[PDB]
Structure formats: structure tokens, C-alpha cells
Amino acid sequence: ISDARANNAKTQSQYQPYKDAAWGFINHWYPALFTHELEEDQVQGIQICGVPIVLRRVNGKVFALKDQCLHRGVRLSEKPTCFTKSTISCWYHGFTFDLETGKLVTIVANPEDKLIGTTGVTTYPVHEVNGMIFVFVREDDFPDEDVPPLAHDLPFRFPERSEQFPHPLWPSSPSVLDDNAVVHGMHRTGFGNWRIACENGFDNAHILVHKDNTIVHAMDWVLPLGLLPTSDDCIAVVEDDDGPKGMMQWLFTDKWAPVLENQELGLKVEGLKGRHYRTSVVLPGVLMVENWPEEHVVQYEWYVPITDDTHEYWEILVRVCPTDEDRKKFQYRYDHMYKPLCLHGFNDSDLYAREAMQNFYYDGTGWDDEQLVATDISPITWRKLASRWNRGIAKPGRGVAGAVKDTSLIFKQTADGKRPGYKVEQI
Amino acid sequence: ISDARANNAKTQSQYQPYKDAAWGFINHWYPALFTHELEEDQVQGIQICGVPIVLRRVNGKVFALKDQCLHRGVRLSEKPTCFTKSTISCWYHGFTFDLETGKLVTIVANPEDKLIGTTGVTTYPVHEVNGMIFVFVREDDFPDEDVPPLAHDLPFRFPERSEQFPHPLWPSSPSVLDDNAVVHGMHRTGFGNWRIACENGFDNAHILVHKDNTIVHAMDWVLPLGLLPTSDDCIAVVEDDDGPKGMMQWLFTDKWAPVLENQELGLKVEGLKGRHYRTSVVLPGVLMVENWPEEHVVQYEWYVPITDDTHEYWEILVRVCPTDEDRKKFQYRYDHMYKPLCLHGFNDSDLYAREAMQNFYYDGTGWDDEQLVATDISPITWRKLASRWNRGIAKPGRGVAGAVKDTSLIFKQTADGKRPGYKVEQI
Amino acid sequence: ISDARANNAKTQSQYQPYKDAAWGFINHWYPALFTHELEEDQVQGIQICGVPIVLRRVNGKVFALKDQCLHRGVRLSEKPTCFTKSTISCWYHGFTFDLETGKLVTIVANPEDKLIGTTGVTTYPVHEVNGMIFVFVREDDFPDEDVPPLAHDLPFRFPERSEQFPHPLWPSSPSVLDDNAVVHGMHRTGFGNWRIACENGFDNAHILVHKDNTIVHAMDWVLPLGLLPTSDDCIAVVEDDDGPKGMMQWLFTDKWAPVLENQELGLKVEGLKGRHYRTSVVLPGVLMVENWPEEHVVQYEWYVPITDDTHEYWEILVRVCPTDEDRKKFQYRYDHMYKPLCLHGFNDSDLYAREAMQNFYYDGTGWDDEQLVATDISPITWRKLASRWNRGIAKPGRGVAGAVKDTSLIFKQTADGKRPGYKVEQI
Ligand code: FES
Ligand code: FES
Ligand code: FES
Ligand SMILES: [Fe+3]
Ligand SMILES: [Fe+3]
Ligand SMILES: [Fe+3]
């Protein structure tokens, strides 16, 4: 371990909370499911920050409660059982909860029990917009009054912030919150801790991972070895009360210079063909790549913690489509261009790169022994702001799936060929 | 956690031993194998309460010894090797043991070693009757003269106890011990702790789990939401020296009233069609369902601890068949009725309901945080009597299969598609 | 536990370091790959003694470095990336290391970083000879000038030591170091600790394991029950400075007598049909079986530790083949004789016998509770010499594959059907 590494003792002491958040930052908004994954009267169970959550759509509205019956702890989502439009019941002994408040309103075959009405399950705020269902995953005692607006946990919006973050080389990126904004993408389980997966996206030295991607050569791009920071303010940290807490990297300005050569090895690039884009990241860990893969289109990624060693990776492309025809154009270009070359292919390289780094950090070794360099100003800056502004550190799961990693149940599922997952299997 | 729950501090303190028995209650009789699973000269390895056991039938008689060579700990049952009618040898280095006493009588290629005769492996009493081989799984130092009769660990017998447990609505249920009693059924490995699997069988509020079973609607039954206790003595606890230690639930009497409605949800049943039956459980955890699925037939269930998170679930139907004709009719009805609709179908629902609850309890959370209600007088009563009358608490396995849950051998087997099991695979 | 067992307290205290070496003996030579497994410009990752290692052949020469980028710990071997003949780069962020010294010579897209040249990854000495690539797996601080010659970690050589270890009944066994010595064989991952796999090879009481092997009855052999030591010097321990550290068993002399009968079981052999051979073992745990399976042919086995519960089992046959014709005869006899009847068949029996013993020892139980006998003078003598002459005890892996056994990555791979392994999968 060299003394020339950027993550020295003082620097590391600045992001201890981050090192302690293996299970994720709780009391934040996270994408839960795509609208198409939850139809009218459909019930679905998931897990975020170690918290089991069940969702149901009733009369067009989505509700979210803890997927844990308070009687004997089974998941309510394994066998969806709802007798009324305003409740969800446990299929085992009939404990029935109010969708709106989560209160135990009754017990199917024991309507007069003294336990009724004296307790209930945790509820989770839901915000569905333009094809996506977001859920505010919170601790049991986080007050309703303190729940912030979804926007506070989403990337910086444009043109709203075009003056704060000038972007003369490309038109404004749309937000999932914008009217007529259309979302195309997917989410799948990533194997490894969410933090390590999150840090890859805005790292300007990992470009090497994409050197051989097909889209790179199909688009005749002659990529740069990487990007180097040239000044101390190459990244802007934003932490105002009203708004997202995160950072913006001044890519395509002189604060970040592209590298073309290496005299040792003897490498040197002389074809400056490429794309104009910009990355930023905000709590709870949302990446935004402006002007990617093309103008008017933007890519967003989430690394939702499920347990301390799995996460649900989201990858979407957004574009505002005012007319029925605009939607068809975007759907078409996604289907025959974006999805096969960008989401699959370009990003697949990121997928395995993240996994390859997990072993170094899981038992704690990497958080101490990693030897960061100049380009690592990016993850380091992120860790510090995340440590300062997170709304809570999730506690390890207890008495839920994922609390114990080597149960006979898990070996059974594994024997049957099932990998660690996210969506609860039913029946 | 509501103060209105039945399992308060005082109640919980009354079943600490039960909370401590994850590996099972040792020094008890357990069904090991069906007679048809062990033919003349056949050797089979199994595991109960964490204890590896090997059985062999010689001249019609079954013997059981610890499936662990005292030399270097391999399982004797993996490659059956017996040179004489009175012994079983280890296929590795030849240590040979007397089937009757378990003494080390010799070593194939080292007949004069001084270790010979100075030690041996543990023996386990066997009791085979009407198609079933029972084994008294005991600690290494439990004395032979202290082994109790099998009947002490089997359900209450009728008509012997018909006066103690009146049953005017149905004929007496037969015992596996009765002459001409015929057994039909099966046992399979269940994933999760034995205690949680055991408590489901006699719970009168889980009826909801069967609301959709095919047999229920094929037999025009209009089930009750559940059953509620009406008096403090709705369950009779029996604990006399000579006899089984357990409890009898006074089903189909004043003490247990069927629930027909729930005003909150607006539910209400008006078709009282069903079956007459009665459940009781005795240590080590044997369920008896009288008059099920039909008169003169009785169902018995065991949840034999294998390790602390797997158990062997037994499900059998018994009926006395004095003549060859009676046996054919019972075999036929089992094959084309009981098996497909009852053992499979009705009980399969219980199988998955048990599993769904295991995660809440494995790490200990559920044993403290569960919020039991009125109908839970059943499991609570069982945990108390079990705590008071068990003949021992099995210690965790050491140096045996299951002692460690994440060995490379287990990952290899899992990769090959093999789930956690019970019967040792040979060769 | 009987007091008549050979491994009494005093004896056990003589091999504590061996009990402590679950991860293996480090600072020793080990077979890494067969020459055919690493062609010109090919890169391959492996793991020995918990240490991740990557090899590459350049201009005919093989180099080995630690398969762990010092930046953020990914394995360099997962996506082979080399820009020059004298280096190997990390495919993630471009850290580049010198093959010869392991020094960090540059960073592709950050050639001026202050970290460059101030550190590097560990290098491992390589000795390739007659088809086998050996690697000196050492601790990070083991001096280059202290690396001993490969021969010190290889079995005793003949005729060099024919006078020291007289063998009138068979011609001298060739060494992998001999000119024109040809190697044929294979290595595969073994499931369980290396020590338990290693001790089986030179045990003279496990002969029973091969009683049914096809080659035994195809060769009309009437095997002995086993062999017993007759004198205290039945094993010669060698520990001179210049040379291998190990032991030679005086098989086929009166110090080891074959057993023909067992009066207790009534067994007795009358047909002394067999083969002449002799076993010896040297650190780090290499077996040599002289005159096996035929004259002029010798079998060597390694049990290379990968982690503390997996090892790479090597099984090779060596014969000196001066002419092109001699090589074809050996290749032929291996292909249609040795491989099918000896490597597979005879040795497959040893493979499963080793596995069956692993559970007793992994949690520590067996290392204390095993009850060894007279024939165990063999493993006991080996444990003592190993404890005394090992060049170091490998420390548990940290921040590398194998450091944590139940990661979601391991469950993913297992779910996909992949067993624990050795060679790193690429892409
Ligand atoms: S576990 Fe849900 S009602 Fe009993
Ligand atoms: S392990 Fe059984 S005789 Fe050696
Ligand atoms: S992990 Fe290897 S260069 Fe970053
Ligand atoms: Fe990338
Ligand atoms: Fe049931
Ligand atoms: Fe052998």
C-alpha cells in the first residue's frame, strides 16, 4: 500500500458512513417496478434495503406495505389474497391489513381478537409517473410528514438547471418527471454490493472497458484512453435544501481532459471521434448521462440495494414524445438500436466489470486497501457527499429473506437452478 | 409489537427449552424408514436430530448404529460393506463393528491392534411394526435400561382412551401398533426447521390455507373461516408417567366454535358442510388426525429433525385391514383417492405454508417478535408441554454432514442439482 | 475416545502447525498448469494457497504475477489485456504491470500519476519442464534470493538415491526433471481440504478401497487385506538441507508385512498375486509411487490447496522416452490402458474415499477426535515432518475469491450449475 494513493487516512475518515451502508441508505425514493409489472388487482413482492415490500394496484392506484405478516412473518405476496378493495390479507391465518394505513383491521376467522386495531404493518409512500413506480423505502418510525418529494431523490432537472450547469454542446436532457416523457429499459438483479456497482458509472477512467464494444466501432468512434481532472473544481457538489444532493462533473470543458497517449506502453490515439455527454450522480445513488446515446435522449441508472450483497440494477432511456408518432419512433429506435447495442452490449461490459470488483470489498478489505489515484476524485467525492446527506443507514435484515445467506431454503432454490433474485415467486 | 399479543414475556419464558431445541429433542422414538426401504441385507444411511444413523436388516431383523466410523469419520453407509451376519465394516480401512453392541470387534487388515475392543459406535434401539421402522435416537450416554416403550412416543390409542377422550361422532382411530393395521404414505425432506413445520398441523386458524383445495369442492364442502376456543380448557394436556406426553384438542364440542362471519370484510358462510375430525400432538412432535380423511382411517404426521434447518416430513394414513380383501380396498382407495387428493393437494398446501414461515424464525427473530393471538393457544400449549417433558435437547452436529452449511461439498452437490436431503447416496 | 489410539496427546502436540495449515504451506513449489494449457500469448488465472495467480507466456517464456490489480482488486485474468511483450494491464482502469518485476510501470489513461513506479504486484518464480509449469507460491515478502530449487520440493530422485533407498525388485523411477521424461495425466478440482486428500495416497491400510477395481481382476491380482508395520523404522524420514524433506516407506521388505487373514470375520487370502511398488511423500505434499503401474513408469500426485476446502488434484505418470517411437508407445499405452484403468477406475476410488472423510475434519472435530491405529504411523510421521519443515503457513484469503464462501456471486454460479473450481473463467 503506497503513500502516493489518493485515499489516505484523512480522506477515508470522511466517508465512514458510506462504508457502513452495505445494506443501503434508507428513507429514500427508489424505483420499485415498471408500471407494466403491476396491473389492476395485481400483487407483487420485492425487497429494497433489506426491507420486504408488497405492492397492489386498486382502482388504478398503487399501494405499498411491508411484505411481512405481523402474526408469524410470512410474505403476504407469496399467495395474493385480497377480500376487499381497501385491504390485503395474509393467506395463512387471515390477518387483514388496511392498504392506506397498514392497520390490522381484522382477522378473517377471529374478528374479535384483542390484537385487532392495536397494531399494523409499515406503509411506504408511492409515486407512479410515466411508466415507473417509485417507492419511498423508510424505517418503521420515519414520519409521513417528513417524506420529501420524489424530485429530491432524482437527478438534476433541465432546463430548470441549465444556468447552474451550462451545456452549450447539447440540448436539455428530459426527466422521468417531465410531461410526455417516455421510459424504455429494464432492471435485473446484480450480484454484489450496490455501492461497488454504483461507482462504476461516473468513473472517467473505466472507459477502457468499452474499447471493444460493437457500437463504438459501428459508430466509427476512436475513443480516448480516458479523462483526467485538470482542476480542483472539476466536480460541482450540490447540497441545497430544496433539491437533489449530489455532484455534477464538468465533462467536455477544460476541467476534464481526454487522454490520447502513453509513452511507456507506446500507445497514442489520433482520431478524436466520439459523443458529447455528461455524468452526474445524486443520492440515493442515481446516475444520469446527458445526451446519451443521442441528442434529446438521456440514460438513467439505479443500483437499488436488495440485501448487502445483491442489488437491482435499473437501466433506462428517456425521451419526451409529445405525439403518438414520436412514441413509435422512440420505441422503434429502442427496439432495433438502443437495446441491442447500448443497454445490451455497451452496458453489459459495465455489468461484469462491477461484479469483478465485489470480492475485494465484501469482507471489508478493499474499503481500506484500495489504492485510488487522480481519476478517483469522482468516487471519493461521491462517498463524502453520500456520507453527509443520506437520510439513514439501513440496518441488516432480521427475520426476513436475506437475513441469513446459507439457509436450506436457499440451497434448495439454488439446487433447482434459481439465482438470487428480486421479485417474489408466487404460489 | 402490541401488548395485546398472547405471547407475553411470562408466556415466552415458559417455553425457553423449546426455543433452544432447533436441532430437535433427543432420546425419543422417530420413524426412520418404511419397511419397504430396507430389504434383507440392505444397508441405508440417514440422519435424525443431527445424528447420522446407518441401518441394516439381517435375518429379518433391523439394527441401527451411528453412521460414523470412529477411525476417521466416514459414513459406513456410503459403500455398504458387511463380511458377516453380525457386523458391518467401514469400506475405507476396515474397522468392523458388532451390529448388536456397536463394539469394535476387529480391523480387517490389522486384527491385533490394541484399539480393538476398547471402544465402539453408538447403537440405537429399533422397533419395527406394520410397515414402519422406528428408531430411538439417543445421546451416546443414554442407558439401555432407560429406553422407554415406543408407545410412549406415539399418539394416544383408541379405544383404549375413548373414555378419557370421548368421540361420539366417529369410530375409534387405529394405531400403527394395532394388529392388522396397514400403513400407506410417504416421507420427504422439508426445507426449514422442524418446530415451525410441526406447529402448522394442529393450528385451527390455518384452515384458510385449504379454502381452494380440489378435494374441498369435489366433496361439496363449505368450510368455516376457522375455529375459535371458547373456554380455557379447550385443550387437555396429558402428562402421566406411563403413556404419551401431549395434548388433545376438543374439536367438535362447545370448546371450539367454527367461525362463519367477518363484518369488517363483509364475509359470512352459510353452508355448514364438512368433516368430523380431531387433532392431537404428542412428543417428540407427532400429529394425529382422527377420522381423516374418512371413518376408520387416521392420518399421522412426523416432522423429524435432520439438522437445525431441515426435517423429514412423514405423512401416513392408517386403517385396520383384517383380510386380504380389506387390504386391496384400502390400497385402491389410497392409490386413486387419498394419495392424489389428500396427501398431495390438501397437504401440499401445508407444505408451502410451513416453508413460508421459516425465514422469520431461523435467526431467532420470530421466536421473540411473533405476535400470537387467541387461536395460538394451540402452539403455545404445545411448546410448554414439550419444554417440560422432552427427554433431552439435541446438541449441534459436529464433524458430521450438516455441521457446516457452506462446505465446498455442499456447493458441488447443489451445482449438480441436488437439494438438501435425508437418505445417504451410495457409491 | 479410547486411550489405545495411536494419536495420543503427546503425539498430537507434535503436529499442531499441520492442524493450522488448512490454507496450505506457502513458500513452496506447486504444479500450476500443464504446458499445453498455456500457449504463446495465452493468459490464465488460477489460485493456490488462497493466492490468486495469473500466468502469460511471451516469446516462449512463462511469467506469473498476483491475479489482483492493486487499484481496485479485480482479477487481471478475467479479460486478458496486454499491450506489449513485457507487460500485462488491468482491463478495467488500465493499471499496467511489468511481467518480470510486477512493478506498476504506467496507467494507460493516466501516465503521469504519482502512484506509478511506487508499487507493484507480487511475482512468482516459474520453472517449466517436460510439459509442466511449476510456480513458487510465496508470501509477498519472501526474498527472491531465498527461493530454493524446484527439486527441493519434488520427490526423491533415482538412481541418485538408489543407494539410500535400495530397490532390488524394480528399476529406478524417472523424475519430471529427467531428460526425455514424458508426462501424461491430468488435474481436476477436489472437493475438500488438501490435507485429507493428501494422506490417503500413502496409507497402507486403505487398500480395501480398491478390492473391486477392474484392473485388479483384469490383471488377476489377489490383493492382501493391507500392510502392517513390523518395526519402528518402517519409515525413513529425510530432512537434510540440500534436498527434499519427506519420508520413504520401506514397502516390500520385512518392515511392512502383508495381511492375509482375519479370524474374527473368518477372512483369509491365499493367492499372493500382485505388483511391486513403493510410496513416499515430500513437502509440500507430493506422492511418488515407484514402479506403478508398470516397470519404468512412475505415478506422481499433488493435492494443491486452492482455498481451505478445495484443492487441485494432480495425477500423472512419467516415463523416460528417448526416441519418437518410445513416445508413441507411451502415449498409446496411456490412452488405451493407464488412463482408463488406472487414472480413471483405480484412482477414482481414492477420489471419493477422500471426499467421504472431509466432513469429520472441516470444523476441527476430526483433527482431535480421530482414533488412529498402528497403520496410521504413515500419516502421523508425515504430519510431524510437515509441521517441522514447511516454509510457512498460508494465511486465509482476504479480499479475493474464496475469502467468503457464501457470496451471492457464488450462489449465482452454483445456480447456473458451476461447481467450485480452479481455472478462472474469462470474458
Ligand atoms: S402468518 Fe399471517 S395470519 Fe398467521
Ligand atoms: S475411516 Fe473407517 S476404517 Fe478408516
Ligand atoms: S481495478 Fe485495475 S485499474 Fe482499476
Ligand atoms: Fe461504462
Ligand atoms: Fe393443513
Ligand atoms: Fe488408493
Instruction: Name every residue whose Cβ is closer than 8 Å to that of residue A141 and which is 6 or more positions away in sequence.
Output: none
**Exposed/middle/buried for B14, CB within 10 Å: 0-12, 13-18, 19+?**
middle
H helix runs in A3-65, sequence order: 9-13, 16-19
**Exposed/middle/buried for B112, CB within 10 Å: 0-12, 13-18, 19+?**
exposed
- How deeply is A22 buried, as exposed, middle or buried, from its count of CB atoms within 10 A (0-12, 13-18, 19+)? buried
Residues A265 and A363 occupy one common structural domain: yes
Asked if omega into A284 is within 30° of 0 (cis), the reply is: yes
- DSSP 8-state assignment for residue A396: P
The verdict on C194 and C335 lying in the same domain is yes
Task: Write the DSSP string, C150-173.
Answer: GGGGSPPPTTTTTTTS--TTSPPP
CB contact at 8 A, B205 and B375: yes
Q: Which helix (H) or strand (E) holds C386?
A: helix C377-389
Residues C174, C289: contact at Cβ < 8 Å? no
Same domain, A107 and A211: no
Q: Which among C95, C106, C108, C400 is the best mutation to test ligand 3's pocket, defined by most ligand atoms within 8 Å of the CB?
A: C95
Residue A325 corresponds to which cell in the numbers above?
408518432
- Candidates C97, C92, C135, C99; CA nearest to C118 is C97
CB contact under 8 A, B399 and C5: no
Q: Confirm or reject: Cβ of C94 under 6 Å from ligand 3.
A: yes
Hey, is the C-beta of A226 within 8 angstroms of any chain C C-beta?
Answer: yes
Whether B195 contacts B18, CB under 8 Å: yes
Q: Using an 8 Å Cβ cutoff, are C198 and C25 in contact? A: no
Instruction: State the residue for C-alpha cell 467525492.
Output: A381
Q: Which helix (H) or strand (E) holds C88?
A: strand C87-89
Task: Compute how many other C-beta atoms are within 10 angstroms of the C-beta atom of residue A142.
Answer: 18
User: CA of A226 to nearest chain C CA: how many angstroms apart?
Assistant: 5
> Which B residues 16-75 touch C at CB under 8 Å?
68, 70-75
Identity of residue C99: L
- The arrangement of strands across the sheet holding A51-58 comes to A43-48, A51-58, A61-66
Q: Cell 513458500 maps to which residue?
A: C27
Q: What angle do CA A137, A142, A148 make, to 5 degrees?
A: 65
Q: What is the DSSP letter of A425?
A: P
Nearest Cα neighbor of C319 from C351, C343, C295 is: C295
Atom of ligand 3 nearest to the CA of C70: 2
What's CA B315's distance to the chain center, in Å? 9
* CA-atom Rg of chain C in angstroms: 23
3-state class (DSSP) for residue C212: coil
C-beta of C92 in contact with ligand 3 (< 6 A): yes
Smallest Cβ–Cβ distance between B92 and the set C209, C374, C418 belongs to: C209
Give the method used. X-ray
Measure the CA–CA gap between C425 and C427, rounded to whole angstroms: 7
Residues near B253 by Cβ (< 8 Å), separated by ≥ 6? none
Q: At C125, list the grid cell.
A: 518464480
Q: Which residue(s) pair with B266 in the sheet?
A: none
> Is residue B37 located within the same domain as residue B131?
yes
The residue whose grid cell reads 392506506 is: A100
Q: CA-to-CA distance for A261 and B243, rounded, in angstroms?
A: 88
- Can you tell me the distance from the alpha carbon of C349 to that of C347, in angstroms, rounded to the nearest whole number? 5
Secondary structure of residue C210 in the 3-state scheme: helix
Co-location of A159 and A172 in the same domain:
yes
Joined together, the cell numbers standing for residue A369 give 486497501
Q: What's the DSSP call for residue A389?
A: H
Q: Is residue C69 part of an annotated ligand binding site?
A: yes
Residue C126's CATH number: 2.20.25.680
Q: Which letter, b or e, does each residue of B32-69 get, where b requires 16 or more Cβ atoms within 10 Å of its Cβ?
A: bbbeeebeeeebbbbbbbbbbbbbbbbeeebbbbbbbb
Q: Among the residues of B234-337, which ranges form H helices?
A: 324-333
B4 plus B20 within the same structural domain: yes
H-type helices in B127-256, by residue range? 194-200, 214-218
**Residues A250 and A350 both lie in one domain:** yes
Q: Read off the DSSP letter of residue A173.
A: P
In angstroms, rounded to a whole number, what is the distance separating the alpha carbons of residues C194 and B408?
12
Is C74 near ligand 3, meaning CB less than 6 Å away? yes
Same domain, C318 and C359: yes
Q: A348-358 burial string, b = 16+ CB within 10 Å, else e? A: ebbbebbbbbb
Contacts of A120 (CB under 8 A, 6+ apart): A70, A97, A98, A101, A102, A103, A104
Scanning every residue of chain C, which has its alpha carbon at the shortest distance from the alpha carbon of B73?
Answer: C360
Whether residue B24 contacts residue B50, with contact meaning beta carbons closer than 8 Å, is answered with yes
DSSP-derived letter for residue A258 is E
Q: Exposed, middle or buried by CB within 10 Å (0-12, 13-18, 19+), for C365?
A: middle
CA distance C159 to C149: 19
B373 and A115 Cβ atoms separated by less than 8 Å? yes
Whole-number Cα distances in Å, A8 to A74, A358, A377, C106, C327 = 46, 21, 12, 21, 59
Q: How many other C-beta atoms lie within 10 A of the C-beta of residue C297?
A: 23
C-chain residues near A367 (CB < 8 A) = none
Which stretch of DSSP H or E encloses residue A387? helix A377-389
Tell whether A295 and A320 lie within a shared domain: yes
CB C100 within 8 A of CB C134: no
Contacts of B98 (CB under 8 A, 6+ apart): B86, B87, B105, B120
Residue at a domain's end among C78, C110, C142: C142
CA nearest A422: which of A332, A310, A291, A341? Answer: A310
Q: How far is it, in rounded angstroms, from Cα C380 to Cα C383?
A: 5
- Cis ω before A31 (30° cut-off from 0): no
- The DSSP secondary-structure symbol of A25 reads B
Q: How far is CA C190 from the centre of its chain?
A: 11
- Give Cβ neighbours of residue C60 (< 8 Å, ≥ 6 apart): C40
Distance CA C175, CA C177 (A): 5
Rounded CA-CA distance A47/A43 in Å is: 14
Report the candidate in B234, B340, B241, B233 with the shortest Cα–Cα distance to residue B278: B234
What CATH number should be reported for the domain holding residue A311?
3.90.380.10
Cis peptide, bond prior to residue A125, ω within 30 of zero: no
Facing B259 at nearest CB: one of A83, A109, A414: A109
Q: Which residues pair with C18 in a beta bridge?
A: none
The answer to whether the CB of C43 falls within 8 A of the CB of C55 is: yes
CA of C265 to the centre of ligand 4 (A): 71
Cell of A83: 377480500
Three cell numbers written together for B3: 401488548
* CB contact at 8 A, B297 and B284: no
**CB within 8 Å: C404 and A191:** no
Q: Which three three-digit cell numbers place residue B195?
A: 418446530
Cell numbers 417440560 label which residue? B388
Helix (H, G, I), strand (E, B) or coil at C325: helix
Q: Is C361 helix (H, G, I), strand (E, B) or coil?
A: helix
The separation between CA B207 and the C-alpha centre of its own chain, rounded to angstroms, equals 21
β-strand B256-259 against C310-320: which pairing, if any? unpaired
Separation of alpha carbons C176 and C153, rounded Å: 12
B389: CB partners within 8 A, 6+ apart:
B239, B245, B283
Residue whose C-alpha is closest to residue B405's, from A405, C50, C422, C401: A405
- The residues with which C301 forms a beta bridge, in sequence order, are C287, C315
Q: How far is CA C404 from CA A23, A416, C307, C309, C408, in A?
A: 17, 23, 10, 12, 10
Q: What is the C-alpha to C-alpha distance for residues B346 and A91, in angstroms, rounded to an integer?
A: 15
Q: Is the Cα torsion angle C212, C213, C216, C219 positive or negative in sign?
A: positive
Last residue of a domain, one of B93, B109, B142: B142
- What is the maximum span of chain A, computed from C-alpha positions, in angstroms? 81
Residues 275-314 of C with CB under 8 A from B: 307, 309-310
Structural domain containing residue C94:
67-121+400-427
Residues C45 and C55: their CA atoms lie apart, in Å, by 6
Q: What is the CATH number of the domain that holds B84?
A: 2.20.25.10
3-state secondary structure of B319: strand
- What letter represents residue C158's amino acid? F
* Residue B176 CA, distance from chain mean position: 14
CA distance B33 to C344: 35
Is B210 annotated to bind a ligand? Reply is yes
- Judge contact between B34 and B312, C-beta under 8 A: no
Same-domain pairing of C95 and C221: no
In this complex, is the C-beta atom of B407 within 8 Å of any C-beta atom belonging to chain A? no
Documented resolution in Å? 1.8
Cα–Cα distance, B11 to B16 (Å, whole number): 10
Query: Looking at this protein, which amino acid is placed at residue C28?
Result: H
| Stretch (H or E) spanning C377 | helix C377-389
CB-CB contact of A95 with A70 (8 Å): yes
Instruction: Count CB neighbours of A282 within 10 A.
Output: 24
Of B371, B374, B420, the CB nearest to A110: B374
The label of the residue with cell 429502442 reads A334
State if residue A116 touches ligand 1 by the CB under 6 angstroms criterion.
no
Query: How is residue B322 written as a grid cell?
Result: 383384517
Give dist(CA B342, CA B347) in Å, integer.
6
Note which residues in 102-131 of chain A have CB less than 8 A from chain B. Answer: 105-111, 113-115, 118-119
Least CB–CB distance from B107: residue in C310, C373, C414: C373
The pairing of beta strand A132-137 with beta strand A126-129: antiparallel
Query: Cα(C90)–Cα(C94) distance, rounded to whole angstroms?
Result: 5
What number of residues does chain C have?
A: 427
Report how far residue A157's alpha carbon sits from residue C87's, in angstroms, rounded to the nearest whole number: 45
Contact B421, B189 (CB under 8 A): yes
Q: A110, A112, A141: which to substitute to probe chain B, counting the most B Cβ within 10 Å?
A: A110
**What is the distance, to the nearest Å, from the Cα of residue A193 to the centroid of all Cα atoms in its chain?**
12
Dihedral sign computed on CA atoms, order A61, A66, A70, A73: positive
Residue C395 DSSP one-character state: P
Give backbone dihedrals phi and psi of C297, rounded to 5 degrees, phi first: -110, 140
Torsion B19-B24-B30-B31 (CA) sign: positive
Spatial distance between the Cα atoms of A99 and A56, rounded to a whole number of angstroms: 9
Element (H, E) at A132: strand A132-137
Identify which of B87, B90, B116 to mutate to test ligand 2's pocket (most ligand atoms within 8 A of the CB): B90
Question: What is residue B196's three-state secondary structure?
Answer: helix
Residue B73, helix vs strand vs coil: coil
Cell numbers linked to C368 = 482431535
**Smallest-distance ligand from the CA of C208:** 6
Name the grid cell of B396.
Answer: 449441534
C29 Cβ neighbours under 8 A, 6+ residues apart: C127, C134, C135, C136, C137, C148, C150, C152, C153, C154, C284
Determine the distance in angstroms separating the CA of C54 from the nearest CA of chain A, rounded to an integer. Answer: 15
In DSSP notation, B335-347 reads IIIIIIIIIIIIH
Q: Cell for B19?
A: 426455543
State whether residue B366 is helix, strand or coil.
Answer: helix
Q: Residues within 5 Å of ion ligand 4 by Cβ?
A: A 350
DSSP of A299-343: EEEEEEESSSSEEEEEEEEEEE--SHHHHHHHHHHIIIIIIIIII
How far is B54 from C281, CA to CA, in rounded Å?
Answer: 35
User: What is the C-alpha to C-alpha distance for residues C2 and B354, in angstroms, rounded to an integer?
Assistant: 44
Residues A164 and A138 in one domain: no
CA angle (A58 as vertex; A54, A64 as ends), nearest 5: 25
| CA C358–ligand 2 middle distance (angstroms) | 12
CA distance B174 to B320: 7
Is B71 among the annotated ligand-binding positions?
yes
Q: Is the CB of C188 under 6 A from ligand 3?
A: no
Using CA atoms, how far apart are residues A175 and A299, in angstroms rounded to an integer? 10
- Angle, alpha carbons B391-B396-B401 (nearest 5°): 120
Of C295, A226, C193, C342, nearest to B407 by C-alpha is: C193
- What are the Cα distances from residue B385, in Å, to A232, B231, B238, B402, C346? 71, 19, 9, 28, 56
For B250, the grid coordinates are 376438543
**Are C314 and C187 spatial neighbours (Cβ–Cβ below 8 Å)?**
yes
Given a contact as 3+ CB pairs under 8 Å, which chains touch C?
A, B
Question: What are B427's strand-pairing partners?
Answer: none
C-alpha cell at B233: 380448557
> Same structural domain for residues C94 and C174?
no
Smallest CA-to-CA distance from B138 within B48, B54, B62 is with: B48
The verdict on B141 touching C (C-beta cutoff 8 Å) is no
CA B150 from chain center: how many Å?
14
DSSP reduced 3-state for C338: helix
Cell of B384: 410448554
Distance of residue B64 Cα from the nearest chain A Cα, in angstroms: 27
DSSP classification of residue B145: G
Using DSSP, state whether C268 is helix, strand or coil. Answer: strand
Contacts of B296 (CB under 8 A, 6+ apart): B171, B174, B319, B320
Domains: count for chain C: 3
Side chain identity, residue C202:
F
Q: Cβ contacts of residue B159 below 8 Å, gap of 6+?
A: B172
Q: A106 and B262: CB-CB below 8 Å?
A: yes
> A212 in contact with C at a CB cutoff of 8 Å?
no
Q: Given phi > 0 = left and psi -120 to 50 = alpha, else beta, which region is B354?
A: alpha
At C236 the three-state DSSP class reads strand
Residues of chain B contacting residue A87, judged by C-beta atoms under 8 Å apart: 265
Chains that touch B (3 or more CB pairs under 8 A): A, C
Please report, to the nearest 10 degrees, the dihedral formed by the alpha carbons of residues B164, B168, B170, B174 taken in order: 20
